[PDB]
């Protein structure tokens, strides 16, 4: 399982000269710096995954590849069964080159030109982008916020689904950027609204294995097992820091949509991406638990630091993700900042974060801080953020 | 380098092995090793331990790619015009949707690589065929047919392989200039798919379509190292769009992030790959010389000409099919009767009846065994 190894998440790993979006690409995406912005980790991809790739390279040929037989399916479904009690048939499992690429195709297949998509806000920005790329109009449902604890406004969602032409809801479970791990009851409530109004739901569950100790993930399609218009997207891209390998799982239980998918996704997989992902499912549990423990300690430190140093900020330790969602309303008002907070923190603090502009709606005054970094790196960044805000 | 090496491809999820003991001469990847200079570039990228979000930043990749095209074909292009797809067919599917409306048509010469048609099918675009002519033994474009169809029909786009699959033609400057002129006069976009451009016989030289026809901005070029370096699995392709509007559509509507292992592998091929590639091409040439002699001596009624490019042999077996009244796919025939997997005419759209395509990017001793089995199956109960 990888429980006996001693990992070093304190390790500082150089990311210069790797064409890393994190290092090179902040200007195009957002518009000596300490990087706490785009959601990849500064932790190394685990050696059990890297070694699987090395062993595939030793086979010398990198030709046309697809997922043949049952071994990949068995590893994935074994993971979902063990961890969430969630099973699906091999025939329902298809693959995308990353979840957002998958979302773009799914939205086009499900929605006609006149149909609308619903998203709860604040939101991961590419949910909206995926609707824009398909000329599909989006309706926002603002989440209710009590000091960093967000909840779905079910009356708002019901009203919008009833009186707007909503064909599709794109949903993050667990949620980015608020970090909510939705309960069975919350998912069942939303499911009933969607079923009653023949609305499709895509459940993006890419954060589902990054969560605080004691948290349990419930797949949307586990909470609502009766409805074939729930599509599930899962990956090892976030959990194992392999977003560059662009390989994702899509579980489509609706025959019509599956057949449609299978007419445009004419296979062709990356052998290195497949062996890396399979290695995570088969061998990565011990490293992943060690990672989550270290993360929990990063969050405990951040919580203490905000309480002491930025007491007017609102922050709750999230149930999931390695992303801290911090309300800096007080400081923004006081200092009278009227440029994007991401600009402000680059210019004034030499720290890259994501601001309200990256989260679609209902994000005013917030920043998102990526803390999947060595504790010492996080401490430095926080020091610079504090210095930029205080009086 | 040892191109004779037998490399085990079982347990690698390879389409070539799993997609259909048997001799494999079908799907277009090599049984030759991806060269160590490429594999080692991937290994040193793994030593940087993080496989996060990646894009082609800076100008180092561009410098490596344009240095290759300049040295090898005297072709240069602007860094602004270079964009990327996850394989050439993924690129074509996107370009066809951007270029064509639903009542537009596309033109392909035939026989053709199947995905030219499939890329039109997926975008609900009707294809028109212009069959290549066989009258000197080498295949040639029927320019009169091309002119007629482009003038009389609503052809928006021509998808063209330079060099050609499956005939292997390396088009001359004059052939390309002539075709380009037809396309320009009729406002037809041209996608020149040049993926085979570095796999060619010693006496052949590649001219990019955009080199032959340098003052027409609706020539789109696609190049990759996937065929030449046996890295099709890494799904990373270059697309050169010289038309500002289409480039803007690509830059706007194209969602694009890259695989760091794919980028480093391709870049390494351009920077350090030339020595291995020259050696691979010399070994390939020798495979073709053996194949030509073998067909002349052992299957005289077969029609074959050494292809100017590619590692793919296009063989007319019409005589044998007619004499034996073979009524099944030639791929099924050879699987059942020879234990050899080839690609039959059914993969090449049109103008392919009676042909097979044989992949000879394999150890020479594997090729010879395969050819012997093909011959025995065809001449069984023939005088």
């Amino acid at each position: 399982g990888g429980f006996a190894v001693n990992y070093n998440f304190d390790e500082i790993i150089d990311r210069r000269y790797t064409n890393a979006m994190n290092v090179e690409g902040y200007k195009g995406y957002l518009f000596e710096l300490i990087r706490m912005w785009v959601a990849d980790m500064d932790f190394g991809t685990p050696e059990v995954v890297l070694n699987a790739i090395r062993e595939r390279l030793n086979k010398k040929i990198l030709g046309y590849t697809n997922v043949f037989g049952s071994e990949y399916y068995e590893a994935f479904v074994s993971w979902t069964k063990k961890r969430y009690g969630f099973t699906f048939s091999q025939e329902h499992l298809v693959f995308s080159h990353g979840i957002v690429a998958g979302l773009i195709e799914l939205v086009g297949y499900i929605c006609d030109k006149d149909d609308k998509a619903l998203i709860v806000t604040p939101s991961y920005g590419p949910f909206k982008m995926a609707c824009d790329k398909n000329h599909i109009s989006t309706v926002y449902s603002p989440l209710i916020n009590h000091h960093g604890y967000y909840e779905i406004d079910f009356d708002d969602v019901r009203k919008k689904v009833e009186t707007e032409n909503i064909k599709l809801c794109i949903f993050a479970n667990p949620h980015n950027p608020t970090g909510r791990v939705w309960s069975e009851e919350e998912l069942a409530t939303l499911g009933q609204i969607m079923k009653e109004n023949d609305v499709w739901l895509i459940s993006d569950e890419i954060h589902c294995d990054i969560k605080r100790s004691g948290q349990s993930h419930i797949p949307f399609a586990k909470a609502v097992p009766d409805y074939d218009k729930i599509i599930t997207t899962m990956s090892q891209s976030k959990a194992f820091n392999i977003a560059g390998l662009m390989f994702s799982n899509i579980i489509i239980q609706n025959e019509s949509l599956l057949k449609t998918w299978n007419t445009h996704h004419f296979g062709t997989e990356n052998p290195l991406s497949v062996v890396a992902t399979q290695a995570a499912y088969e061998k990565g549990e011990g490293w992943l638990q060690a990672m989550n423990h270290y993360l929990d300690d990063n969050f405990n430190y951040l919580a203490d630091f905000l309480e002491k140093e930025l007491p007017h900020a609102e922050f709750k330790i999230p149930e999931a993700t390695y992303l801290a969602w911090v309300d800096l309303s007080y400081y923004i008002k006081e200092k009278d900042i009227d440029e994007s907070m991401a600009k402000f923190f680059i210019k004034n603090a030499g720290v890259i974060i994501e601001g309200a502009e990256q989260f679609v709606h209902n994000a005013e005054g917030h920043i998102r801080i990526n803390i999947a970094v060595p504790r010492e790196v996080m401490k430095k960044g926080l020091q610079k953020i504090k210095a930029a805000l205080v009086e | 380098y040892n191109f004779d090496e037998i490399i085990d491809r079982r347990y690698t999820n390879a389409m070539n092995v799993e997609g259909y003991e048997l001799i494999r001469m079908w799907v277009a990847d090599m049984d030759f090793g991806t060269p160590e200079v490429v594999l080692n570039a991937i290994r040193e990228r793994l030593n940087k331990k993080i496989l996060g979000y990646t894009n082609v930043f800076g100008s180092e990749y561009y410098e490596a790619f344009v240095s290759w095209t300049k040295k090898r074909y005297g072709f240069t292009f602007s860094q602004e015009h270079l964009v990327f797809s996850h394989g050439i067919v993924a690129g074509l599917i996107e370009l066809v949707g951007y270029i064509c409306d639903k009542d537009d048509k596309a033109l392909i010469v035939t026989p053709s690589y199947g995905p030219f048609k499939m890329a039109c099918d997926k975008n609900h675009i009707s294809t028109v065929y212009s069959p290549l002519i066989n009258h000197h033994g080498y295949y040639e474009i029927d320019f009169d047919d091309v002119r007629k169809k482009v003038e009389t029909e609503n052809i928006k786009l021509c998808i063209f392989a330079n060099p050609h699959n499956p005939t292997g033609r390396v088009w001359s400057e004059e052939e390309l200039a002539t075709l380009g002129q037809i396309m320009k006069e009729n406002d037809v976009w041209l996608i020149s798919d040049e993926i085979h451009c570095d796999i060619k016989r010693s006496g052949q030289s590649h001219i990019p379509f955009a080199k032959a026809v340098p003052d027409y901005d609706k020539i789109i070029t696609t190049m990759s190292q996937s065929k030449a370096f046996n890295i099709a699995g890494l799904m990373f392709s270059n697309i050169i769009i010289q038309n500002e509007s289409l480039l803007k559509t690509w830059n706007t509507h194209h969602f694009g992030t890259e695989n760091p292992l794919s980028v480093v592998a391709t870049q390494a091929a351009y920077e350090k790959g030339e020595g291995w590639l020259q050696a691979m091409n010399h070994y390939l040439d020798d495979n073709f010389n053996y194949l030509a002699d073998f067909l002349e001596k052992e299957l005289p009624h077969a029609e074959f000409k050494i292809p100017e490019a590619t590692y793919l042999a296009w063989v007319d077996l019409s005589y044998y099919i007619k004499e034996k009244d073979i009524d099944e796919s030639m791929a099924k025939f050879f699987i059942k009767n020879a234990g050899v997997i080839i690609e039959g005419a059914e993969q090449f759209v049109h103008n392919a009846e009676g042909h097979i395509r044989i992949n000879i990017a394999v150890p020479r001793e594997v090729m010879k065994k395969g050819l012997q089995k093909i011959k025995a199956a065809l001449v069984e109960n023939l005088y």
């Binding site: 296979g267 | 997609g19 277009a28 995905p115 048609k117 499939m118 690609e343 993969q347």
Partner: peptide, 6 residues
């Protein structure tokens, strides 16, 4: 099903 085929 190889995408080169049909």
């Amino acid at each position: 099903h190889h995408h080169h085929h049909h």
